[PDB]
């Protein structure tokens with residue numbers, strides 16, 4: 001069995017959150033930790049959660065593979081469940097991008113000579129943004145299968161070919177030493193229901209009107225700004241009569257366009273005002 | 289939808305390398321133009337099929 | 340004759356109603372994904 | 381002794397580790413799950429950042445048969461210090477659903493390992509609640525509400541779930557299917573208003589139910605609770621007279637401001653319509669004179 | 673010419689060329705290209721051989737009189753080395769006797785029963801996959817309960833290589849009948865198996881189960897289209913497609929549009945749009961009007977779905 005291209009690594013919420021927390025805490029040191037999961041089958045590599053290996057005084061090299069810490073953590077994690085294998089290791093590459101280096105290749109070789117199906121997930125906390133956490137597992141090419149030129153990839157499905165290899169990743173060599181894998185975060189109803197709590201305000205804050213002096217100073221300032229912006233709008237309309245389109249396409253690049261400011265001020269003050277009215281009336285009626 | 293597609297495609301286009309400002313000191317031929325690019329030296333550039 | 344015209348017009352109306360509901364829902368989700376893509380970029 | 385119990389902040393990782401722990405050890409009903417709440421302290425706002433599992437055991441019997449390993453706490457401490465020396469033990473959490481008998485007793489076991497007063501974190505791991513499933517309970521000593529010996533008991537603290545840069549990225553990625561990223565400002569504020577009103581109604585119903593219980597003497601008489609309720613009644617303003625006139629004049633001024641803003645919005649729409657009509661006429665002329 | 677600029681040192685290109693050759697001589701009882709470029713067939717590893725034998729089966733479609741003996745030097749018992757060629761042989765044998773097959777059904781049932789006992793043997797699993805795919809094909813609508821039981825036996829082996837084919841054959845065997853027991857069994861089993869392939873296979877089997885029963889399949893649409901596993905909604909789309917198949921009923925179309933616009937997993941979006949294309953197959957004039965709005969969406973999966981919808985509708 002020459003593997004397949006439809007192989008997908010399933011990262012749980014716990015694993016990804018711990019990954020990001022540990023990666024951001026060690027910038028720019030390439031911290032590394034193991035990856036507790038299970039091999040469901042040939043096509044799926046489940047990952048339950050991860051724990052961090054200590055970063056020895058090496059600097060920006062992933063070479064601290066201390067065995068005492070790994071053995072102790074594995075043995076006395078068993079006391080409270082998590083009976084799983086040593087499926088993979090993750091190390092953060094902050095700033096450069098998702099790609100393996102020679103040291104990373106050697107470490108993954110060491111892991112492969114122990115499990116032969118060990119992924120090499122590479123977090124990147126620096127260039128990750130709220131919705132596009134960049135994550136992609138890797139696994140080394142076999143060896144002399146390049147004589148057959150059949151790197152272990154049987155495209156029995158389109159699910160693996162959809163992902164596109166990165167540009168700079170190919171520079172370090174993607175399809176030359178480690179065929180890429182797919183990443184599929186699998187959630188749970190309990191977890192997604194209740195992570196919503198991060199954006200649930202305190203109950204005793206909705207009916208709290210703020211001090212009734214700032215709500216008048218803000219209104220007066222907004223009205224004065226509106227007057228000035230309306231005057232600027234008048235002069236804008238006056239000046240627009242004798243301008244050619246090749247300038248208007250670039251006219252308001254460097255100066256305040258006195259139209260979007262007017263609309264923004266109107267909308268913001270109207271929203272604030274409506275909220276203030278509703279809060280005042282609601283408390284005046286219900287609180288009494 | 290056109291706005292959304294443009295915004296989605298913008299991410300790839302930003303990573304494409306930029307372009308130097310050139311200066312046409314002399315026209316050489318019908319397909320080669322001598323251009324002095326600031327601030328290092330000059331080059332014999334190729335005109336696109338539009339210009 | 341006339342019955343066929345009535346039924347064809349009814350079918351056209353019903354398909355158009357499908358189209359209208361489709362377009363409204365797609366408007367809402369295009370707003371959502373526009374905000375998401377603006378954030379992602 | 382440090383008084384640091386004003387505010388509590390929890391990163392989502394501690395809580396999700398709690399949920400993972402509960403779903404991992406296959407805890408059935410009545411089986412509580414307990415771990416440690418590693419974080420940073422010595423400031424006014426106690427902040428919980430990381431957690432781990434503990435081999436807590438207890439039979440549903442006499443409350444003193446609770447068992448917990450002592451070496452495990454220090455053994456986890458050493459490894460976590462090796463990983464990060466900025467996270468120190470600040471107490472413990474249990475997997476809800478509500479306070480139990482041994483909470484005061486077991487808290488003293490963590491007194492030596494902790495440096496400040498140990499922090500209790502209730503986690504509604506099975507999610508019966510509607511608001512935040514987390515609340516803090518710092519064990520402090522205060523006089524009895526019944527005029528009896530001073531008791532060392534728990535005090536509720538205002539707990540707010542807040543994430544840092546590292547965990548906000550993951551939270552935003554994970555629930556990037558249900559959160560309404562469009563939403564709208566005024567709409568979301570009004571929704572928050574309605575949610576707050578519903579929460580007020582729920583708390584009022586709970587207080588009414590408790591009073592109904594106390595009149596039947598299923599619970600004893602606490603004079604502190606009754607005094608707080610009477611203070612709540614005293615603080616209730618009477619509106620339905622001078623305050624009424626002041627509120628009316630402020631509302632009138634505020635509505636006038638709203639009127640002005642709506643007028644400005646309408647004129648902006650007018651300019652947009654004029655410009656759009658101009659561009660449409662230009663496009664029509666373009667197509668007409670270029671076709672011909 | 674196609675084989676020229678398509679290296680056989682690629683499972684993708686080898687499978688492409690094999691499938692194209694099978695379609696070029698579909699039912700023509702002529703494997704001249706295969707009998708000419710034998711070295712090209714030599715460049716087949718693992719699942720590539722499966723597709724080659726399947727194409728050989730496609731070529732001899734309708735040759736019920738003498739088709740078994742051509743597949744005889746590929747069936748179990750012969751001097752075949754790779755298990756992927758015996759599995760492909762069974763698949764092609766099921767392919768050849770499509771519809772008018774009763775001896776093939778018995779032969780494949782015997783093979784399934786004999787070899788289903790073994791568990792974990794990587795040689796047994798591929799043969800089981802091929803035999804199950806064949807026997808499901810040789811029992812389309814026959815509602816052979818013995819075949820269904822033999823296919824349930826293999827699917828319970830929990831093997832990810834034979835699980836998908838076992839589920840698909842189980843769905844094909846009970847096609848259209850809508851058995852109230854197979855429905856419950858497969859739906860319950862889909863929510864337990866950790867393997868991803870088996871879940872989608874069971875979803876597609878459930879979709880095949882409800883073929884034709886328009887009002888009777890109103891349930892399992894509220895369930896699966898509101899399920900949590902993103903693979904089960906993919907099956908709900910196809911269940912809508914096959915329940916209200918060629919009818920144009922508006923409940924199905926409205927729900928399909930709602931799924932195709934409001935969902936996170938793009939795979940289900942593609943499935944929903946393909947289902948939309950399948951529902952309106954009797955109104956092929958209208959389809960390029962509903963899908964015209966679909967074909968300009970930002971998401972590429974929806975575009976592939978509407979392409980497939982056009983392909984299915986105006987076939």
Ligand SMILES: [Zn+2]
Pocket residue numbers: 030062091093100101103104
């Ligand atoms: Zn590295």
